[PDB]
Design a protein around this ligand. Structure first.
Ligand SMILES: COc1cc(C(=O)N2CCC(N3CCN(C)CC3)CC2)ccc1Nc1ncc2c(n1)N(C)c1ccccc1C(=O)N2C
Length: 108
Protein backbone atom coordinates (compact mmCIF):
# COMPACT_ATOMS: atom_id res chain seq x y z
CA UNK A 1 0.00 0.00 0.00
CA UNK A 2 2.96 2.35 -0.53
CA UNK A 3 0.96 4.17 -3.21
CA UNK A 4 -1.80 5.00 -0.71
CA UNK A 5 0.80 6.32 1.75
CA UNK A 6 2.40 8.54 -0.89
CA UNK A 7 -1.13 9.85 -1.48
CA UNK A 8 -1.51 10.63 2.24
CA UNK A 9 1.85 11.91 3.50
CA UNK A 10 2.97 13.53 0.22
CA UNK A 11 0.19 14.35 -2.25
CA UNK A 12 -2.48 15.33 0.29
CA UNK A 13 -0.10 17.16 2.63
CA UNK A 14 1.41 19.15 -0.24
CA UNK A 15 -2.01 20.12 -1.60
CA UNK A 16 -3.21 21.06 1.89
CA UNK A 17 -0.26 23.40 2.57
CA UNK A 18 -0.81 25.15 -0.79
CA UNK A 19 -2.15 28.70 -0.52
CA UNK A 20 -5.28 28.02 -2.57
CA UNK A 21 -6.48 24.93 -0.63
CA UNK A 22 -8.69 26.29 2.15
CA UNK A 23 -12.00 26.35 0.16
CA UNK A 24 -11.41 22.64 -0.45
CA UNK A 25 -10.61 21.69 3.15
CA UNK A 26 -14.31 21.04 3.95
CA UNK A 27 -17.39 19.99 1.96
CA UNK A 28 -18.89 22.83 -0.07
CA UNK A 29 -21.06 24.77 2.40
CA UNK A 30 -24.40 25.23 0.63
CA UNK A 31 -25.73 27.45 3.43
CA UNK A 32 -22.76 29.84 3.53
CA UNK A 33 -22.41 29.94 -0.27
CA UNK A 34 -26.20 30.05 -0.77
CA UNK A 35 -26.48 27.07 -3.13
CA UNK A 36 -29.94 25.48 -2.94
CA UNK A 37 -29.13 23.19 -5.92
CA UNK A 38 -25.51 22.16 -5.21
CA UNK A 39 -26.19 18.80 -3.51
CA UNK A 40 -28.99 18.17 -6.02
CA UNK A 41 -26.94 18.34 -9.24
CA UNK A 42 -23.50 17.38 -7.85
CA UNK A 43 -24.01 13.67 -7.22
CA UNK A 44 -20.60 12.86 -5.69
CA UNK A 45 -19.40 15.85 -3.65
CA UNK A 46 -15.80 15.60 -2.52
CA UNK A 47 -13.29 17.59 -0.48
CA UNK A 48 -9.80 17.31 0.95
CA UNK A 49 -10.96 16.57 4.50
CA UNK A 50 -13.11 13.67 3.31
CA UNK A 51 -10.07 12.29 1.47
CA UNK A 52 -8.00 12.80 4.61
CA UNK A 53 -10.47 10.88 6.79
CA UNK A 54 -10.77 8.06 4.24
CA UNK A 55 -6.99 7.67 4.06
CA UNK A 56 -6.70 7.65 7.86
CA UNK A 57 -9.51 5.07 8.08
CA UNK A 58 -8.05 2.86 5.29
CA UNK A 59 -11.32 3.33 3.40
CA UNK A 60 -9.66 3.00 0.00
CA UNK A 61 -8.77 -0.44 -1.33
CA UNK A 62 -6.29 0.82 -3.93
CA UNK A 63 -4.60 4.06 -4.97
CA UNK A 64 -6.87 4.52 -7.99
CA UNK A 65 -9.94 4.94 -5.78
CA UNK A 66 -8.31 7.79 -3.86
CA UNK A 67 -6.96 9.37 -7.07
CA UNK A 68 -10.52 9.29 -8.43
CA UNK A 69 -11.79 11.20 -5.39
CA UNK A 70 -9.13 13.86 -6.00
CA UNK A 71 -10.26 14.17 -9.62
CA UNK A 72 -13.92 14.31 -8.58
CA UNK A 73 -13.13 17.24 -6.28
CA UNK A 74 -11.63 19.22 -9.17
CA UNK A 75 -14.30 18.32 -11.73
CA UNK A 76 -17.18 19.05 -9.33
CA UNK A 77 -15.70 22.52 -9.01
CA UNK A 78 -15.30 23.05 -12.76
CA UNK A 79 -18.76 21.60 -13.35
CA UNK A 80 -20.76 23.74 -10.94
CA UNK A 81 -18.89 27.01 -11.44
CA UNK A 82 -18.14 29.13 -14.54
CA UNK A 83 -15.04 29.79 -16.67
CA UNK A 84 -12.81 32.43 -15.11
CA UNK A 85 -14.26 32.18 -11.59
CA UNK A 86 -11.71 32.60 -8.79
CA UNK A 87 -12.42 29.15 -7.31
CA UNK A 88 -11.91 27.54 -10.72
CA UNK A 89 -8.53 29.22 -11.09
CA UNK A 90 -7.69 27.89 -7.63
CA UNK A 91 -8.86 24.37 -8.51
CA UNK A 92 -6.69 24.40 -11.63
CA UNK A 93 -3.53 25.37 -9.74
CA UNK A 94 -4.20 22.62 -7.20
CA UNK A 95 -4.89 20.13 -10.00
CA UNK A 96 -1.59 21.00 -11.70
CA UNK A 97 0.16 20.45 -8.36
CA UNK A 98 -1.77 17.20 -8.01
CA UNK A 99 -0.80 15.93 -11.46
CA UNK A 100 2.86 16.84 -11.08
CA UNK A 101 3.05 15.00 -7.75
CA UNK A 102 1.35 11.96 -9.26
CA UNK A 103 4.33 12.10 -11.63
CA UNK A 104 6.55 11.05 -8.72
CA UNK A 105 4.36 8.27 -7.33
CA UNK A 106 6.29 4.97 -6.65
CA UNK A 107 4.98 2.68 -9.46
CA UNK A 108 4.52 -0.39 -7.22
C1 LIG B 1 -17.90 30.65 3.26
O1 LIG B 1 -17.13 30.07 2.25
C2 LIG B 1 -16.77 30.96 1.21
C3 LIG B 1 -17.19 32.28 1.10
C4 LIG B 1 -16.77 33.05 0.00
C5 LIG B 1 -17.24 34.51 -0.15
O2 LIG B 1 -16.47 35.41 -0.17
N1 LIG B 1 -18.68 34.80 -0.29
C6 LIG B 1 -19.78 33.74 -0.34
C7 LIG B 1 -21.18 34.21 0.07
C8 LIG B 1 -21.62 35.50 -0.55
N2 LIG B 1 -22.78 35.24 -1.51
C9 LIG B 1 -23.58 36.44 -1.70
C10 LIG B 1 -24.78 36.15 -2.59
N3 LIG B 1 -24.42 35.47 -3.83
C11 LIG B 1 -25.63 35.05 -4.52
C12 LIG B 1 -23.55 34.32 -3.64
C13 LIG B 1 -22.34 34.65 -2.76
C14 LIG B 1 -20.54 36.23 -1.25
C15 LIG B 1 -19.24 36.20 -0.46
C16 LIG B 1 -15.91 32.52 -0.95
C17 LIG B 1 -15.46 31.21 -0.83
C18 LIG B 1 -15.93 30.47 0.26
N4 LIG B 1 -15.59 29.07 0.51
C19 LIG B 1 -15.74 28.11 -0.58
N5 LIG B 1 -15.63 26.77 -0.36
C20 LIG B 1 -15.75 25.95 -1.39
C21 LIG B 1 -15.98 26.43 -2.66
C22 LIG B 1 -16.08 27.75 -2.87
N6 LIG B 1 -15.96 28.58 -1.84
N7 LIG B 1 -16.33 28.18 -4.25
C23 LIG B 1 -16.10 29.61 -4.24
C24 LIG B 1 -17.72 27.94 -4.68
C25 LIG B 1 -18.73 28.90 -4.81
C26 LIG B 1 -20.00 28.52 -5.24
C27 LIG B 1 -20.31 27.21 -5.55
C28 LIG B 1 -19.33 26.25 -5.42
C29 LIG B 1 -18.05 26.63 -4.97
C30 LIG B 1 -16.96 25.56 -4.90
O3 LIG B 1 -16.86 24.75 -5.78
N8 LIG B 1 -16.02 25.52 -3.81
C31 LIG B 1 -14.99 24.50 -3.83
Amino acid sequence: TNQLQYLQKVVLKDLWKHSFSWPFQRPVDAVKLQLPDYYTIIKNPMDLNTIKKRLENKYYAKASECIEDFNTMFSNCYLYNKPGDDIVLMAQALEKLFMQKLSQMPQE
